[PDB]
Amino acid sequence: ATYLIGDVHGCYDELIALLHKVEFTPGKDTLWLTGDLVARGPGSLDVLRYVKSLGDSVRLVLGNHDLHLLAVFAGISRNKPKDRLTPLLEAPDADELLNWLRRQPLLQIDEEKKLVMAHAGITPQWDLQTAKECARDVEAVLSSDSYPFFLDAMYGDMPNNWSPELRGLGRLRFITNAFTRMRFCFPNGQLDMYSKESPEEAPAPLKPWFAIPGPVAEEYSIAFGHWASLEGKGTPEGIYALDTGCCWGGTLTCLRWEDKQYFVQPSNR
Ligand SMILES: [Mg+2]
Ligand SMILES: [Mn+2]
Numbered sequence: 001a002t003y004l005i006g007d008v009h010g011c012y013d014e015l016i017a018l019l020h021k022v023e024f025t026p027g028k029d030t031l032w033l034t035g036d037l038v039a040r041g042p043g044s045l046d047v048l049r050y051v052k053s054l055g056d057s058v059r060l061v062l063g064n065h066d067l068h069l070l071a072v073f074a075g076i077s078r079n080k081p082k083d084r085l086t087p088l089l090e091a092p093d094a095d096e097l098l099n100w101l102r103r104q105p106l107l108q109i110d111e112e113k114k115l116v117m118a119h120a121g122i123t124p125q126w127d128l129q130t131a132k133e134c135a136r137d138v139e140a141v142l143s144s145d146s147y148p149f150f151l152d153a154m155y156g157d158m159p160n161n162w163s164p165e166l167r168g169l170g171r172l173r174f175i176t177n178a179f180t181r182m183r184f185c186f187p188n189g190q191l192d193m194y195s196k197e198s199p200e201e202a203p204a205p206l207k208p209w210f211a212i213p214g215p216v217a218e219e220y221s222i223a224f225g226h227w228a229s230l231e232g233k234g235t236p237e238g239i240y241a242l243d244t245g246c247c248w249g250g251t252l253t254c255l256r257w258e259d260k261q262y263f264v265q266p267s268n269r
Contacts, residue, residue, distance in 0.1 A: 010041025011043065061119050117224065
């Protein structure tokens with residue numbers, strides 16, 4: 001079976017309880033995770049240890065809090081107490097876990113299921129070939145010996161409009177923002193980097209990225225996490241918003257792909 005779970009955010013107990021609920025069995029089943037494995041919840045260290053141990057039985061994409069953790073690890077960014085990352089950062093296997101984490105993809109594609117996953121979704125300004133090329137470019141910088149320079153460069157809110165003519169720092173910043181921070185778009189597909197509310201309580205003319213027809217969403221289903229204030233609701237057919245806010249006292253959501261059956265684990269917080 002194929003299971004897809006939204007942002008775990010260090011909620012190890014809930015993750016394991018949910019996987020026991022569906023009798024997840026590596027070697028028979030595959031797990032897709034929308035990223036943001038770490039921060040806010042109490043068990044980022046155990047989550048990373050477990051997800052890494054799954055090997056080919058898990059298909060992960062990186063989220064914005066995963067990248068922030070890498071930035072803290074590399075000395076680029078300051079640790080915020082609220083993220084609860086110190087046990088992971090101080091673990092004897094931190095190097096092994098975090099060098100594994102930075103080698104993971106930003107984008108997962110399964111052609112037989114016609115299924116695409118990214119942390120925040122796929123901007124309507126990208127076709128599939130472009131999304132693939134952009135994921136490959138950022139994955140290449142993250143898996144390189146010089147990844148702290150990219151992590152430093154990634155911070156920023158502009159440019160917010162895609163063009164194949166983008167070059168350099170602006171190109172990487174846009175790619176990172178589209179994959180890991182995007183929520184709302186302007187009518188022309190331009191990213192808005194400030195509004196984090198639900199679609200209904202958002203100011204006009206902003207609309208969810210998935211409400212703007214894009215080439216990828218026309219041919220593929222898209223599963224994503226990130227946007228907790230969406231509460232997993234309000235999406236079109238073929239769009240699966242899996243982040244139901246577990247670390248915030250919401251729920252951890254698991255979708256089984258074969259029958260589109262949902263399984264939910266209450267937050268312990
Ligand atoms: Mg998140
Ligand atoms: Mn996120």
